């Protein structure tokens, strides 16, 4: 592709041709009009899954959730037009997005009635029915997690692009635990690198060894980051990756930092998270050998908003690792309060 760019650090511009990777996580707009395989084909797949004892779908990312939310009405109308007693209801998503052991089956034959495009066909709404097909919401009691499909869509050939506004998807035919490769872009240029997709933006740098610099996540997936899209993927221990492998963290030396282990018990329940290495406001961290061991991550403010000031770690390296969520500043698993009982604090109750 041809383009031009500017570098405010060096105050210089240039043009040419090459490969460019764009940050579409920060300032997340919705510039894509998705649409699945086909109205009749999707309806047939949903119906067959319903008769195969699958009560719902657990979305793999926010993209799939938005897709379902947009095509819900059309799908319901198509289902009703064939006289099928089944309604699809789409709820909200909450992190982390756990796996489901089921997959949507590819239908041999599409439904006979309906139209052949995802365009508004005068939108005559359908009627509510007893049977329901729940897309991820607060409906775990109704449809247990062990009966839900997960990671069953796959972006098509020229379905994603720089100059595009429609993304095409379809139902896959195989079983896999890997994140969709069609939306992943990683690049290293000199002394800066980045692994990214539609939801993750992970930045790395070279100070004296390569290390994590900052991360920005607007979702918590649980697929596996494919090795074909990772830099320096050999001779790495899974106990050193900062972002856990089970949370779609890349298995690379760029996903590490000296003095820290995998953060299995971070505040992964937040809606949007930003990982950065900087002390939380109004706090100070020391390094001493007389501090507690690793444990669940703690928030820097009490439930009443009081701020705890003195913290410590055993072997961690300054500046400390911290998570910046909407409700406050959390610290890494290695950093514990000094001279303060931990029963008074708020901790993360989730694990990866």
């Amino acid at each position, epitope marked *: 592709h041809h383009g031009c760019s500017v570098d405010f650090s060096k105050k210089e511009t240039r043009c040419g041709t090459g490969v460019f990777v764009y940050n579409d996580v920060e300032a997340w707009r919705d510039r894509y009009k998705y649409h699945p395989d086909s109205p009749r084909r999707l309806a047939a797949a949903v119906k067959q899954a319903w008769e195969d004892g699958i009560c719902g779908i657990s979305s793999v990312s926010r993209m799939e959730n938005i897709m379902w939310r947009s095509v819900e009405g059309e799908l319901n109308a198509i289902l009703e037009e064939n006289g099928v007693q089944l309604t699809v209801v789409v709820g909200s998503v909450k992190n982390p997005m756990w796996r489901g052991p089921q997959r949507l089956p590819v239908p041999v034959n599409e439904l006979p009635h309906g139209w052949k495009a995802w365009g508004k066909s005068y939108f005559v709404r359908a009627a509510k029915t007893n049977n329901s097909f729940v897309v991820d919401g607060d409906t775990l009691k109704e449809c247990p997690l062990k009966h839900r499909a997960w990671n069953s869509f796959l972006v098509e050939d020229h379905g994603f692009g720089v100059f595009h506004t429609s993304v095409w998807l379809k139902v896959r035919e195989d079983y896999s635990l890997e994140c969709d490769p069609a939306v992943i872009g990683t690049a290293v240029k000199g002394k800066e690198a980045v692994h990214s997709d539609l939801g993750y933006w992970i930045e790395s740098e070279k100070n004296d060894t390569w290390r994590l610099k900052r991360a920005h996540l607007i979702e918590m997936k649980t697929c596996e980051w494919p090795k074909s899209h990772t830099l320096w993927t050999d001779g790495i221990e899974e106990s050193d990756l900062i972002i856990p492998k089970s949370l779609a963290g890349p298995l690379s030396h760029h996903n590490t930092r000296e003095g820290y282990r995998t953060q299995m018990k971070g505040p992964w329940h937040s809606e949007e998270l930003e990982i950065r290495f900087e002390e939380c406001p109004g706090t100070k961290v020391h390094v001493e050998e007389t501090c507690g061991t690793r444990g669940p991550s703690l928030r820097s403010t009490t439930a*009443s908003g009081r701020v705890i000031e003195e913290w410590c770690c055993r072997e961690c390296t300054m500046p400390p690792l911290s998570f910046r969520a909407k409700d406050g500043c959390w610290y890494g698993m290695e950093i514990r309060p*000094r*001279k*303060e009982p931990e029963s008074n604090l708020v901790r993360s109750m989730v694990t990866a």
Partner: antibody, heavy 116, light 105 residues
Framework: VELIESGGGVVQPGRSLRLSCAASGFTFSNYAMHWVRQAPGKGLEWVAFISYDGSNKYYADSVKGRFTISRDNSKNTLSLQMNSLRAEDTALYYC???????????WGQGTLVTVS | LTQPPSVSVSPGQTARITCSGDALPKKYAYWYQQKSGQAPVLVIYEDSKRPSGIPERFSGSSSGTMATLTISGAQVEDEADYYCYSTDSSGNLYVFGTGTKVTVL
């Protein structure tokens, strides 16, 4: 900013009793509460602790297993269920809000409990 | 946590109250004052800090395993029983001191 507790009285050994403490003047759901007793003319003694959301409870070893603490953030009330009472449990029971740093610590007035 | 059984001070002098126990190096300690017939009143929190409304004559510090409370210019409005409040090694069980009685002459 005031704590009122009640439910005291004279009971026979081996029976059961329940105490309650009503709170008002602050966001009850943001703070952790303690139970503290004091024998007549003796020193203070810690009894039990419950976190702000009620997920974590801890009891002193002397009353471990016999007692049970709970709270209701909807009704601004915490309670202490006591079973298998004994003679050494005769004391004046407080309902405190302690370890709050610069936010101030408040105490109840106490409810005398006697075991005969 | 242990405290002296009792302390007697001449008026105009200063008294030292010591609360000695393990886990103090890793834990804070609050100090409470209880006059006869009343509920206890917080005096020193986090080993050095005075809440608003408390005379400036109250001060305290910790060193290793010894937490000390000092009443500067001990006078009659201090006849009370002082207790140290802290927690054991894992901040899940709290414990009070054995308490000390302060007498002015």
């Amino acid at each position: 900013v005031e704590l009122i507790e009640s439910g005291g009285g004279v009971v026979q050994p081996g029976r059961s009793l329940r105490l309650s403490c009503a709170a008002s003047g602050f966001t009850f759901s943001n703070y952790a509460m303690h139970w503290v007793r004091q024998a007549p003319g003796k020193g203070l003694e810690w009894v039990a602790f419950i976190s702000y959301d009620g997920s974590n409870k801890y009891y002193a070893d002397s009353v471990k297993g016999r007692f049970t603490i709970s709270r209701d953030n909807s009704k601004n009330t915490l309670s202490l269920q006591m079973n298998s009472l004994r003679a050494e449990d005769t004391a004046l029971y407080y309902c405190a809000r302690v370890f709050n740093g610069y936010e101030g610590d408040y105490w109840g007035q106490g409810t005398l409990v006697t075991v005969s | 946590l242990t405290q002296p059984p009792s302390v007697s001070v001449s008026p105009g002098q200063t008294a030292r109250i010591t609360c000695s126990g393990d886990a103090l190096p890793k834990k804070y300690a609050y100090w409470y004052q209880q006059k006869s017939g009343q509920a206890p009143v917080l005096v020193i929190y986090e080993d050095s800090k005075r809440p608003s409304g408390i005379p400036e004559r109250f001060s305290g510090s910790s060193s290793g395993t010894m937490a000390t409370l000092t009443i500067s210019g001990a006078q009659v409005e201090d006849e009370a029983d002082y207790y140290c409040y802290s927690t054991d090694s894992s901040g899940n069980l709290y414990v009070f001191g054995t308490g000390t009685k302060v007498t002015v002459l």
